[PDB]
Structures are given as C-alpha cells and as structure tokens.
Amino acid sequence: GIKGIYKEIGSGERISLCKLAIDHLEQHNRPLRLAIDMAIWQFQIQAARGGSNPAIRTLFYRFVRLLSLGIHPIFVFDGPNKSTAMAKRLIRLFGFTAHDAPGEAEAECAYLEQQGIVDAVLSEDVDTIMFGSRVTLRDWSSEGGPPTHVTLHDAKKIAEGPSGLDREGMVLVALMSGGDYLPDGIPGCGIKVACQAAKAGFGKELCRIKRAITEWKQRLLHELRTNESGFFRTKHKALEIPENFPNMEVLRYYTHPVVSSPATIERLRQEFPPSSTVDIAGLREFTRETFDWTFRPGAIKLIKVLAPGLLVQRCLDRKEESTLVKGISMRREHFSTDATPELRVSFIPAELVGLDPGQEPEVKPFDPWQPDLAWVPETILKLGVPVTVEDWEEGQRS
DNA sequence: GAGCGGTGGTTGGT
DNA sequence: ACCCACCACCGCTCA
Ligand SMILES: [Mg+2]
Ligand SMILES: [Mg+2]
C-alpha cells in the first residue's frame, strides 16, 4: 500500500540528507527537525551480521550519522489504537527524543509536521501524505556504501503534478483499491480506475461530506457503468461495489487519525528539540554491555566512531575555538553531499570525547591522541569555529 | 515495502 | 469464436 503509487506520483527526488540539513540550517538559521518512524528499521537493520546485537549496532551507527548531519530527530513509536527498551535507552544516551504515538506512528509523524513540531517526516512510504504530511522522505540508503541519501516526496508538487493526487485523491484511491487492508473496498478496482476517479473529483467531494453520501455513490457508480462524462478509459459494468461503501469509518481513520492530544503537542513545542549533551559515560557503559566493546580496545573504538559526531553537535550548540578544531587543510564540494561545501578539519578524538583509554584494562594502529581528520559542512563550521574559518580563508587568499 | 513476470479477467473491437 | 491492451492480483525476491 499503496501498490503502484510511484508509477502515478513519481518515484521522488533522490537528495543528499546532508544537503537537506544544511540548506534548512542556512534558510531557517537552526537545525532541521526530523520525525523518524521507528518502523523503518526492521527491514534495513536485520542484515547486519557478526558481533553482539548487530541490529542495534547499526542503529548506533545511524545515530552517529545523525550527529554529524546536525539533525534534531524525534523518533516515533507506534501505540495501541489502530528491542524498544534498548532503543529508547540508546535514543536518550545520544540526547535524542523518543515519542510514543497514541496510534499509528505514521499518522503521528505527519501530524507533528503539520503542527510545526518537525520540518519533514522520514517513514517507510508515502502513507504519511494521506495523513497530512507535506515533505515526506523514505529509503535512507546508499546512492553500496554509506547511507547518504533519501527519496523526497512533496505533497505540493504531487497534487499539482501529472497525477493530480492530493490527500483526498489518494484517500479515495485507498478506499476504492485498498481491498487488502481496508474493509469494504471495491474488488477488481485497482490504482488505475481509482486514480481517474480521484481526478474526476470524487475525492474532493467525499472528503467534504458529513459522515447524503447516497447522491455521490449513485453518481459515481453510474459514471462508472456508463462513463457518460468519459471519466475513465473504459466502462466498468461489472465492478460490484459493496453496499457498505464508502466505509466512512475507514474515511475517518485517514481524515481524523488518532494522534496526540492538543496538550501533548504543546508539551512538545516547549520540550523539543530537547537538550542533547551526549552521555559519553553512558554510551561507554552501553557499548561495553551490548556490543562487547570491552576494555581499552572498546573504549578506543567508541572514541574513533563518536568523535566526528560530537564535533558537529558541539559546533551547533556553540579562543575556546581551538578546543574543538585544530586546523583546516582543504575544501571540496563532493557529489555525495550534492555539492555541499565541506572543510577538512583536524581534531584530537580522545580530547574531544572526554574518555581516557588508560582507565581501562589494556589487553599501523589508531591513536586517539594523534590528530584525526573529518569532512564537516562549511556552514556548520562558520557557526561553531568562526575565526578558524576566517584564518583559513585568509591563508587561502595568500 | 517495492519491483517483476505470470496470469486470469474485462473491455472493446476483429 | 478470437485477438488485444490494459489491468489487478499473485508469487517471488530483495528487504
Ligand atoms: Mg506508514
Ligand atoms: Mg504504511
């Protein structure tokens, strides 16, 4: 669901997540806020093999990636109207927000975006659009290397594009063609004639009706058996429309989905994005117990992986400049960021992270005390370490 | 969830 | 009777 939708609305725009984050940071002078439907993990994550808890090792690595993009994420969990404990623990340890939707997470993500709690939705598909989403993203994946890209769909362009499908058009598409996950849906009716029904206006109409409907179903089911207005390709005098159609309860579930109370939205308005302050000692205990990153090798490995992320996180909360960045050596506009300008920065991983390997039993190599290098987006560096970027730019004009 | 070929059915037209 | 294009649906396969 909805099967074959992308043939209608398009497959969407592939775009560097770093480009979305940095464009938004430049346009709105604050980091991108993302609602992430926690259901997107189940498929991608079950492929990591080896070690201890690989499904949530890779969740760990995606959280470090979100640290370095400078994205403020709210992770949304499904509720009962229609391991998560480690995960909610790991969310907290990274200073991210966990939110339990009352019902479907997709409906709640979309609601958080139209209330302004978040700027975009990352979900598994475009169901979010029937639920009111405007900017919806899916398929955070390589473009087979690191996951750098998402597929962007825009409700404003879709609705005025070739399909013409808007929220009520789609919604009629799922009422007519969704016979396999919604009751009282027209057998033998698929995406093609549901979509030319939507285009003929029957979705705007049904949606603007008090849950009367009889002067619509008869009007529709006659336009189908005869095609008098030529609203479709062929006649359909054999589509048996069930008497309990349109199931308006199924309509209510899309038009008025079960979302958080008004008071909960106001709570989120004051509390998200909440304070980050990555729990360094908490992540050290977590990785020791869950990944078996034991003793000094496991402390040194946490440092290598976490250090570039804290650099970014600390640059967005922000003389004291030298404490995060020792130098800049180059610039690039690499295609993996859709040409976001990045600066090559030096830093001391163990100095930046705050843990000490020698307080752990010792059991070519990587020294957390020597300088490491990372590519960081130039506009994040102008915010956090501004006079270092001047001197490099003055050095460059020399 | 999403893509793909097979397939069995409907429509409209030989 | 039969062809044909279109389509919905299904099993399969990557998840
Ligand atoms: Mg969904
Ligand atoms: Mg869905």
XYZ file of C-alpha atoms (C1' of nucleotides) and ligand atoms in Angstrom:
429
model
C 0.000 0.000 0.000
C -0.433 1.849 -1.997
C 0.660 -0.677 -4.601
C 1.947 1.045 -7.731
C 1.628 4.557 -6.274
C 5.025 5.731 -7.564
C 4.055 4.915 -11.138
C 1.441 7.635 -10.534
C 3.094 10.316 -8.395
C 6.702 9.638 -9.410
C 9.456 7.816 -7.583
C 10.552 11.054 -5.861
C 13.717 13.143 -5.711
C 16.915 11.478 -4.517
C 18.795 14.030 -2.421
C 21.744 14.094 -0.029
C 20.451 14.206 3.563
C 23.399 16.475 4.303
C 22.098 18.869 1.630
C 18.632 18.985 3.208
C 20.064 19.562 6.677
C 22.465 22.309 5.596
C 20.002 24.039 3.221
C 17.479 24.190 6.048
C 20.104 25.379 8.546
C 21.044 28.158 6.100
C 17.441 29.081 5.288
C 15.908 28.935 8.809
C 19.044 29.579 10.926
C 18.526 26.460 13.024
C 18.976 22.700 12.501
C 16.486 20.510 10.659
C 13.946 18.725 12.851
C 13.013 15.249 11.628
C 10.278 12.910 12.762
C 11.514 9.351 12.177
C 9.013 6.483 12.208
C 10.839 3.794 14.182
C 9.336 1.131 11.897
C 11.840 1.962 9.155
C 14.480 -0.040 10.986
C 13.006 -3.578 10.844
C 13.981 -4.244 7.173
C 17.369 -2.490 6.731
C 18.706 -3.430 10.188
C 18.144 -7.260 10.151
C 21.018 -7.615 7.537
C 23.987 -6.746 9.758
C 25.752 -9.932 10.850
C 28.544 -10.545 13.359
C 29.414 -9.403 16.858
C 26.889 -8.682 19.614
C 23.473 -7.126 18.846
C 24.149 -6.196 15.188
C 20.574 -4.924 14.625
C 21.227 -2.177 17.177
C 24.919 -1.658 16.442
C 23.711 -0.371 13.080
C 21.105 1.791 14.822
C 24.026 3.148 16.866
C 25.912 3.945 13.637
C 22.871 5.719 12.113
C 22.626 7.811 15.309
C 26.278 8.882 14.910
C 25.481 9.733 11.297
C 22.597 11.925 12.509
C 25.014 13.562 14.957
C 27.272 14.592 12.057
C 24.441 15.862 9.869
C 23.350 18.107 12.759
C 19.757 16.826 12.610
C 17.404 17.132 15.611
C 15.497 13.806 15.436
C 12.287 12.785 17.150
C 11.820 9.004 16.924
C 8.147 7.977 16.891
C 6.918 4.629 18.285
C 3.560 3.053 17.495
C 0.787 2.986 20.054
C -2.148 0.644 20.651
C -5.075 2.342 18.792
C -5.441 1.130 15.200
C 14.106 -4.274 21.482
C 12.316 -0.993 22.011
C 13.738 -0.593 25.538
C 17.377 -0.727 24.456
C 16.429 1.551 21.572
C 14.718 4.167 23.755
C 17.731 3.920 26.064
C 20.130 4.468 23.154
C 17.961 7.378 21.959
C 18.320 9.065 25.359
C 22.076 8.381 25.578
C 22.510 10.284 22.288
C 20.360 13.146 23.582
C 17.618 12.411 21.041
C 13.872 12.445 21.649
C 11.608 9.419 21.814
C 7.879 9.933 21.339
C 5.165 7.280 21.701
C 2.295 7.965 19.309
C -1.157 7.041 20.649
C -1.910 5.044 17.496
C -0.087 4.650 14.212
C 3.349 6.249 14.186
C 2.965 7.359 10.530
C -0.176 9.327 11.349
C 1.557 10.946 14.308
C 4.760 11.870 12.443
C 2.622 13.596 9.801
C 0.594 15.376 12.480
C 3.809 16.608 14.149
C 4.890 18.116 10.829
C 1.648 19.954 10.111
C 1.697 21.321 13.701
C 5.247 22.586 13.140
C 6.972 20.310 15.664
C 9.148 18.946 12.805
C 10.086 20.031 9.273
C 9.989 16.663 7.474
C 8.937 13.062 8.002
C 11.158 10.015 7.462
C 8.863 6.982 7.051
C 8.763 3.735 5.091
C 6.380 5.022 2.392
C 4.062 7.881 1.415
C 1.067 6.839 3.572
C 2.097 9.896 5.591
C 0.649 12.111 2.824
C -2.901 10.803 3.263
C -2.306 11.648 6.927
C -1.444 15.274 6.131
C 2.314 15.243 5.546
C 3.886 17.843 3.236
C 7.579 16.866 2.957
C 7.960 13.099 3.279
C 11.210 11.124 2.976
C 11.919 7.424 2.617
C 14.725 4.999 1.814
C 17.681 6.407 3.729
C 20.373 4.362 1.994
C 23.472 4.474 -0.191
C 23.148 6.143 -3.554
C 26.694 0.159 -1.993
C 28.421 2.332 0.592
C 27.447 4.685 3.421
C 23.813 5.802 3.707
C 23.914 9.368 2.383
C 20.627 9.842 0.516
C 16.860 9.840 0.962
C 13.980 9.947 -1.510
C 11.970 13.179 -1.118
C 8.290 13.456 -1.939
C 6.432 16.768 -1.889
C 2.656 16.799 -1.434
C 2.511 20.268 -3.002
C 4.197 19.152 -6.239
C 2.473 15.744 -6.413
C -1.004 17.269 -6.159
C -0.248 19.760 -8.941
C 1.843 17.311 -10.985
C 0.588 14.833 -13.598
C -1.333 12.524 -11.251
C -3.174 15.388 -9.582
C -3.303 13.197 -6.463
C -3.809 15.167 -3.261
C -4.599 13.903 0.209
C -8.275 13.292 -0.608
C -7.421 11.817 -4.011
C -5.015 9.314 -2.546
C -7.527 8.681 0.240
C -10.167 7.775 -2.345
C -7.554 5.630 -4.097
C -7.109 3.639 -0.872
C -10.875 3.458 -0.218
C -11.565 2.086 -3.735
C -8.426 -0.010 -4.411
C -7.237 -0.958 -0.911
C -9.355 -4.106 -0.720
C -6.464 -5.914 1.036
C -6.009 -3.873 4.264
C -9.194 -1.812 4.499
C -12.671 -3.335 4.534
C -15.473 -2.737 2.034
C -13.105 -1.888 -0.826
C -14.214 -2.482 -4.431
C -12.984 -5.877 -5.705
C -11.303 -5.736 -9.088
C -10.750 -1.992 -8.648
C -7.094 -1.045 -8.633
C -4.911 2.034 -8.832
C -5.781 2.912 -12.449
C -9.538 3.492 -12.202
C -9.322 4.682 -8.575
C -6.944 7.359 -9.818
C -9.094 8.586 -12.694
C -11.992 8.667 -10.225
C -9.847 10.847 -7.945
C -9.044 13.064 -10.942
C -12.750 13.310 -11.809
C -13.281 14.979 -8.430
C -14.832 12.204 -6.343
C -12.178 12.559 -3.608
C -12.657 16.269 -3.011
C -16.392 15.535 -2.833
C -16.401 12.551 -0.472
C -13.963 14.376 1.802
C -16.224 17.431 2.006
C -19.227 15.382 3.210
C -20.668 14.910 6.721
C -20.192 11.256 7.743
C -26.215 12.466 1.588
C -23.390 10.139 0.580
C -26.107 8.409 -1.466
C -26.214 11.257 -4.056
C -22.460 10.611 -4.540
C -22.134 6.806 -4.621
C -25.004 6.598 -7.103
C -23.444 9.495 -9.037
C -20.072 7.705 -9.030
C -21.260 4.153 -9.703
C -23.303 5.389 -12.688
C -20.387 7.364 -14.135
C -18.541 4.000 -13.975
C -21.034 1.651 -15.631
C -21.708 4.151 -18.450
C -18.705 6.547 -18.493
C -21.078 9.339 -19.553
C -18.627 12.110 -18.625
C -15.867 9.883 -20.038
C -14.124 9.971 -16.658
C -12.216 6.727 -17.370
C -10.652 4.654 -20.100
C -13.402 2.008 -20.274
C -16.798 1.119 -18.885
C -16.874 -0.938 -15.679
C -20.344 -2.503 -15.576
C -19.063 -5.496 -13.594
C -17.303 -3.822 -10.704
C -19.551 -4.922 -7.812
C -19.443 -2.040 -5.301
C -20.226 -3.351 -1.772
C -23.262 -1.771 -0.102
C -21.152 -0.707 2.887
C -19.057 1.514 0.583
C -17.684 4.061 1.100
C -16.858 2.813 4.598
C -16.780 6.246 6.242
C -15.136 4.803 9.338
C -12.185 3.956 7.068
C -12.555 7.525 5.826
C -12.450 8.881 9.402
C -9.226 6.933 10.039
C -7.499 8.987 7.324
C -9.299 12.308 7.744
C -9.176 12.283 11.569
C -6.469 9.765 12.545
C -5.736 9.034 16.195
C -2.966 11.487 17.146
C -1.635 13.112 20.306
C -3.863 15.378 22.371
C -3.607 19.168 21.918
C -1.857 19.414 25.301
C 0.745 16.888 24.139
C 1.528 18.977 21.047
C 2.030 21.987 23.310
C 4.311 19.931 25.573
C 6.386 19.018 22.508
C 6.502 22.669 21.457
C 8.376 23.661 24.609
C 10.415 20.484 25.054
C 11.566 19.507 21.554
C 14.173 19.763 20.446
C 15.296 18.850 23.999
C 18.826 19.254 25.372
C 21.362 16.956 23.712
C 24.574 16.642 25.745
C 25.565 13.178 24.506
C 26.057 10.922 27.563
C 29.705 9.899 26.960
C 29.989 7.691 30.059
C 26.510 6.299 29.441
C 27.374 5.328 25.864
C 30.623 3.826 27.158
C 28.698 1.583 29.578
C 26.061 0.802 26.902
C 28.620 -0.255 24.253
C 30.587 -2.359 26.751
C 27.443 -4.293 27.698
C 25.685 -4.506 24.337
C 28.443 -4.601 21.709
C 31.079 -6.165 23.880
C 33.319 -3.169 23.275
C 35.215 -4.214 26.380
C 38.371 -2.797 27.989
C 40.748 -0.353 26.317
C 40.107 -1.551 22.709
C 36.385 -0.938 23.229
C 36.943 2.487 24.748
C 39.274 3.444 21.881
C 36.739 2.182 19.333
C 33.918 4.275 20.808
C 36.200 7.329 20.589
C 37.024 6.821 16.901
C 33.357 6.395 15.933
C 31.826 9.079 18.148
C 34.392 11.860 17.767
C 33.368 13.453 14.410
C 29.747 13.480 15.591
C 30.404 15.331 18.855
C 32.456 17.811 16.814
C 29.335 18.720 14.810
C 26.940 18.556 17.753
C 29.269 20.820 19.744
C 29.679 23.201 16.794
C 25.914 23.813 16.599
C 25.480 24.443 20.317
C 28.375 26.914 20.126
C 39.726 31.224 21.966
C 37.612 28.276 23.108
C 37.547 27.601 19.333
C 40.761 25.583 19.437
C 39.102 23.129 21.847
C 37.042 21.563 19.039
C 39.123 22.045 15.883
C 42.890 22.191 15.454
C 43.078 23.112 11.759
C 41.603 23.196 8.271
C 43.526 21.875 5.280
C 41.187 21.789 2.288
C 37.740 22.322 0.798
C 35.594 20.228 -1.530
C 32.109 20.030 -2.971
C 31.708 16.269 -3.205
C 28.808 14.681 -5.108
C 27.789 12.628 -2.042
C 26.542 15.858 -0.394
C 25.051 17.132 -3.697
C 27.984 19.581 -3.562
C 27.596 20.910 -0.035
C 30.853 22.777 0.723
C 32.904 20.878 3.288
C 36.109 21.780 5.082
C 38.771 19.224 6.034
C 39.182 19.606 9.785
C 41.649 18.243 12.330
C 40.865 17.363 15.937
C 42.039 15.087 18.757
C 39.468 12.248 19.129
C 40.232 11.400 22.781
C 40.447 15.102 23.658
C 37.061 15.763 22.034
C 35.276 12.733 23.541
C 36.468 13.074 27.146
C 37.122 9.416 27.921
C 40.571 8.144 28.859
C 41.774 4.767 27.462
C 44.289 4.159 30.310
C 41.500 3.938 32.933
C 40.588 0.656 31.152
C 42.499 -2.643 31.243
C 44.950 -2.980 28.356
C 44.523 -6.247 26.532
C 49.632 0.980 11.885
C 47.157 1.391 14.827
C 44.699 4.174 15.779
C 45.931 6.571 18.485
C 43.012 8.607 19.952
C 45.610 11.241 20.927
C 47.038 11.964 17.483
C 45.147 14.293 15.120
C 42.229 12.801 13.165
C 40.631 14.368 10.073
C 36.964 14.735 9.142
C 34.935 16.492 6.455
C 32.468 18.894 8.098
C 29.994 21.154 6.211
C 31.410 24.672 5.906
C 28.342 26.410 7.271
C 28.391 24.304 10.431
C 31.996 25.455 10.901
C 31.189 29.134 10.384
C 28.789 28.860 13.353
C 30.920 26.927 15.818
C 34.511 27.869 14.998
C 34.118 31.172 13.104
C 37.578 32.722 13.438
C 39.296 29.488 12.360
C 37.394 29.573 9.050
C 38.471 33.212 8.507
C 42.162 32.451 9.040
C 41.964 29.512 6.644
C 40.197 31.741 4.124
C 42.810 34.459 4.710
C 45.508 31.799 4.352
C 43.857 30.739 1.089
C 43.818 34.271 -0.381
C 47.565 34.369 0.395
C 7.551 -2.135 1.318
C 8.623 -2.482 -3.654
C 9.933 -4.393 -8.111
C 8.949 -8.109 -11.566
C 6.929 -11.641 -14.706
C 2.826 -14.655 -14.927
C -1.794 -14.918 -15.181
C -6.516 -14.810 -15.480
C -10.306 -11.247 -16.399
C -12.567 -7.386 -18.541
C -13.251 -4.392 -22.388
C -13.653 -3.260 -26.916
C -13.080 -4.390 -31.014
C -11.567 -8.232 -35.299
C -15.358 -17.578 -31.697
C -10.841 -14.826 -31.117
C -7.364 -11.084 -30.514
C -5.853 -7.373 -27.986
C -4.465 -3.904 -24.465
C -4.990 -2.968 -20.182
C -5.131 -4.083 -15.662
C -5.376 -6.233 -10.957
C -3.542 -9.686 -8.461
C -0.071 -13.061 -7.090
C 4.202 -15.491 -6.072
C 8.878 -14.274 -5.696
C 12.515 -11.805 -4.082
C 15.184 -8.086 -2.240
C 14.106 -6.362 2.313
Mg 3.394 4.140 7.168
Mg 2.322 2.064 5.627
